[PDB]
Scaffold this active site. Structure first.
Site, PDB file in Angstrom:
ATOM      1  N   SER A 112       0.804  -1.212   0.000  1.00 14.19           N
ATOM      2  CA  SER A 112       0.000   0.000   0.000  1.00 14.19           C
ATOM      3  C   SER A 112       0.841   1.268   0.000  1.00 14.19           C
ATOM      4  CB  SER A 112      -0.954   0.042   1.197  1.00 14.19           C
ATOM      5  OG  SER A 112      -2.052  -0.833   0.984  1.00 14.19           O
ATOM      6  N   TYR A 168     -10.632   2.093   5.545  1.00 16.25           N
ATOM      7  CA  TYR A 168      -9.468   1.867   4.689  1.00 16.25           C
ATOM      8  C   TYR A 168      -9.838   0.889   3.597  1.00 16.25           C
ATOM      9  CZ  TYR A 168      -4.550   1.023   3.544  1.00 16.25           C
ATOM     10  OH  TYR A 168      -3.341   0.915   2.899  1.00 16.25           O
ATOM     11  N   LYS A 212       0.230   3.616  -2.745  1.00 18.53           N
ATOM     12  CA  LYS A 212      -0.796   4.656  -2.732  1.00 18.53           C
ATOM     13  C   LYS A 212      -0.185   6.046  -2.630  1.00 18.53           C
ATOM     14  CE  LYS A 212      -4.340   1.889  -0.351  1.00 18.53           C
ATOM     15  NZ  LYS A 212      -3.755   0.559  -0.088  1.00 18.53           N
ATOM     16  N   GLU A 258      -0.434   9.117   6.114  1.00 22.50           N
ATOM     17  CA  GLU A 258      -1.007   9.409   7.426  1.00 22.50           C
ATOM     18  C   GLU A 258      -0.114  10.458   8.091  1.00 22.50           C
ATOM     19  OE1 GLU A 258      -0.994   5.576   9.256  1.00 22.50           O
ATOM     20  OE2 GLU A 258      -2.460   4.779   7.868  1.00 22.50           O
ATOM     21  N   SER A 309       2.195  -3.803   2.773  1.00 22.50           N
ATOM     22  CA  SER A 309       2.579  -5.204   2.717  1.00 22.50           C
ATOM     23  C   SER A 309       1.967  -5.853   1.478  1.00 22.50           C
ATOM     24  CB  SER A 309       2.131  -5.994   3.961  1.00 22.50           C
ATOM     25  OG  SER A 309       2.513  -5.350   5.167  1.00 22.50           O
ATOM     26  N   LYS A 322       3.643   5.698   6.408  1.00 26.08           N
ATOM     27  CA  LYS A 322       2.803   4.729   5.727  1.00 26.08           C
ATOM     28  C   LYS A 322       3.455   3.359   5.802  1.00 26.08           C
ATOM     29  CE  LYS A 322      -0.930   3.615   3.513  1.00 26.08           C
ATOM     30  NZ  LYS A 322      -0.951   2.379   4.371  1.00 26.08           N
TER      31      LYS A 322
END
Length: 355
Positions: free
Chosen positions: A64, A150, A67, A269, A312, A309
């Site tokens: 992820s 999420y 992203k 985040e 996995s 962030k």
């Protein structure tokens, strides 16, 4: 006393190296950037059977953390006027016009507040037709914009819209536009044949080697430690880049709402800095990651902040963190999953100890 490169190497050895034995991790790359100086540490093997060492050329799956590149692509398109975050997806994927999902705007998709999108696409959703049909079949549940859940589908639709607005397939938006603008020459959505020798095997929890397209914006990127440190450098120094990508990077740093101590930016985040270890661990708790949570407007706009962030895949783990006012960041890449909390704790101990 002791040279700084040795001091940072010692700290990574003390905090990250033990994880290799504890979780039976074949290979790991850890990098620290401080005051525009890069420190790289490579451990173990990219391929156990080939006895090929992890090195600066080793390519890892980001999960992820991909992203963050989708978020950057979105900021780029927005500041180029190709999209507005108040737009809805049907403006660009016309087949979604007059459907429920066309009530959700682009920022809401990018920050997981559509109100009814789960963590993953259904296993049976594989073709772009099944993806289209998945979204045309989507129906609301909670009020749109009210709850964070999420969701890979959610930011996957965001990225598809970004690609459509730039009239290019998403993989090309990254490999021909965003990665070049960021100076990344070893980052890929699709690893070319000439680089397969550098592509680490991932390893499952039995230490066995392993390795839809519209899910690529959620977890489809591969990269090397030097490239990921350059990306962290870009986030610490947006002013060193052309206005288009500078504005894109800054767009991804803007907190959009809060869930408790966590600020949801685009991809990243965000946290008030200094952040307690528990604040960072909370962002990766089951409550925050797996359940819906009512979001609240930002009240304290933190002047001093940090971002992180985790990501996995079945055979890979990643963690990236940076702290603008300390001019410091850290990247961890492994070719075996380890608990997210270990990644966060180890990074927190290194970054706090660095002089």
């Amino acid at each position: 006393n002791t040279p700084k490169d040795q001091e940072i190497k010692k700290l990574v050895d003390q905090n990250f190296k033990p994880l290799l034995e504890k979780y039976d991790v074949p290979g790991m790359a850890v990098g620290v950037i401080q005051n525009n100086k890069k420190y790289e540490m490579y451990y173990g093997l990219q391929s156990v059977q080939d006895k090929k060492a992890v090195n600066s050329s080793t390519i890892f799956e980001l999960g992820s953390v991909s992203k963050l590149f989708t978020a950057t692509a979105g900021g780029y398109a927005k500041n180029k006027g190709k999209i507005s975050f108040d737009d809805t997806p049907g403006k660009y994927w016309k087949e979604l016009k007059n459907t429920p999902i066309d009530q959700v705007n682009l920022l809401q998709l990018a920050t997981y507040t559509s109100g009814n999108l789960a963590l993953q696409f259904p296993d049976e959703v594989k073709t772009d037709q099944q993806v289209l049909t998945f979204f045309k079949d989507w129906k609301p549940k909670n009020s749109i914009g009210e709850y964070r859940q999420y969701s890979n589908p959610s930011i996957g639709l965001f990225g598809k819209v970004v690609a459509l607005s730039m009239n290019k397939p998403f993989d090309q938006v990254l490999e021909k536009t965003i990665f070049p603008a960021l100076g990344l020459k070893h980052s890929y959505v699709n690893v070319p044949k000439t680089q397969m020798q550098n592509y680490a095997f991932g390893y499952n929890q039995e230490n066995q080697p392993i390795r839809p397209l519209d899910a690529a914006p959620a977890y489809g990127v591969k990269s090397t430690l030097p490239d990921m440190l350059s990306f962290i450098h870009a986030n610490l120094n947006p002013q060193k880049y052309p206005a288009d990508i500078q504005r894109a990077i800054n767009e991804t740093h803007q907190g959009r709402y809060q869930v408790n101590t966590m600020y949801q930016a685009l991809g990243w985040e965000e946290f008030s800095y200094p952040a307690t270890l528990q604040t960072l661990l909370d962002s990766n708790s089951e409550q925050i990651v797996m359940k819906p949570n009512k979001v609240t407007a930002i009240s304290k706009e933190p002047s001093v902040k940090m971002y992180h962030k985790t990501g996995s895949t079945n055979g890979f783990g990643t963690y990236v963190v940076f702290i603008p006012k300390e001019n410091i960041g850290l990247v961890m890449l492994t070719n075996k999953r380890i608990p997210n909390e270990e990644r966060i704790k180890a990074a927190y101990a290194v970054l706090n100890a660095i002089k």
